[PDB]
Write a protein that binds this ligand. Structure first.
Ligand code: GF4
Length: 263
């Protein structure tokens, strides 16, 4: 069946020029709203959540892991390094790298998290360990953002990512301390005000991780605490036919607004 919300999302998609994927989990009743929920989309920087979570999981059996230094060399810098560039020829801890990756979308920081996990496949292995059979990380930054239509590398589905984000932030995929840390990091994101959050009532609170890449790929994944409601998990993925297409964070805001008004 096609719901009123799905019909509205289809109209938004039609006017957008691109391809839109949405998955909502409302933890008030565990119900879901999906739009292209089982189609693959390039994750781009939203994959930073899985990498940070995997390191948090490792830290459950190593009390000092988040304080472990990682050398940052000039050669390690990639295309977007707002935090790591400050610490070149020195070190950053795994906690610092996690915060930089999540809250500033630092790509050097992401690469250090991936290396700590033994490469992209280590991130995928963690996904499988927490019940996500769909997620795949194949490459490091920046090439994981090529976002080529039809390319399965570095993709997931909206349904899978919403379920995983729920398990990580609200469920028991991580220990309590680690779950709280992940939520704290997400709630301190600096990059999200124009994306999902822009479509939500101001009274609501949220944590999120944005992503963007080639083909005008514009993504956001969020955990949301609505005023007077149980939390929501919302994934919005968007990608366009031309390699050099511009970002469309407004489309994600519009999708979130449709979802919010449909509650
Ligand atoms: C490397 C610069 C960059 C890309 C390609 N995407 N992205 C981003 N968008 N939303 N969150 N991170 C960025 O900050």
């Amino acid at each position: 069946q096609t719901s009123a919300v799905q019909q509205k999302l289809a109209a938004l998609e039609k006017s957008s020029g691109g391809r839109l994927g949405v998955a909502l989990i409302d933890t008030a009743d565990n119900t879901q709203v999906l739009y292209r929920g089982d189609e693959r989309f390039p994750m781009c920087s939203t994959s930073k959540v899985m990498a940070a979570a995997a390191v948090l999981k490792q830290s459950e059996t190593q009390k000092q892991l988040l304080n472990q230094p990682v050398e940052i060399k000039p050669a390690d810098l990639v295309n977007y390094n707002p935090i790591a560039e400050k610490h070149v020829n020195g070190t950053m801890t795994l906690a610092e790298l996690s915060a930089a990756a999540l809250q500033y979308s630092d790509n050097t920081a992401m690469n250090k998290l991936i290396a700590q996990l033994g490469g992209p496949g280590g991130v995928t292995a963690f996904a499988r360990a927490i019940g996500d059979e769909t997620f795949r990380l194949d490459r490091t930054e920046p090439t994981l953002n090529t976002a080529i239509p039809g390319d399965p590398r570095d993709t997931t589905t909206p349904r899978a990512m919403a379920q995983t984000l729920r398990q990580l932030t609200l469920g028991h995929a991580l220990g309590e301390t680690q779950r709280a840390q992940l939520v704290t990091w997400l709630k301190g994101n600096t990059t999200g005000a124009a994306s999902i959050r822009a479509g939500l009532p101001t009274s609501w609170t949220a944590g999120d991780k944005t992503g963007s890449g080639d083909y005008g790929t514009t993504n956001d994944i969020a955990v949301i605490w609505p005023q007077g409601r149980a939390p929501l998990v919302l994934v919005t993925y968007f990608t366009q036919p031309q390699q050099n297409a511009e970002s469309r964070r407004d489309v994600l805001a519009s999708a979130a607004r449709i979802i919010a008004e449909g509650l």
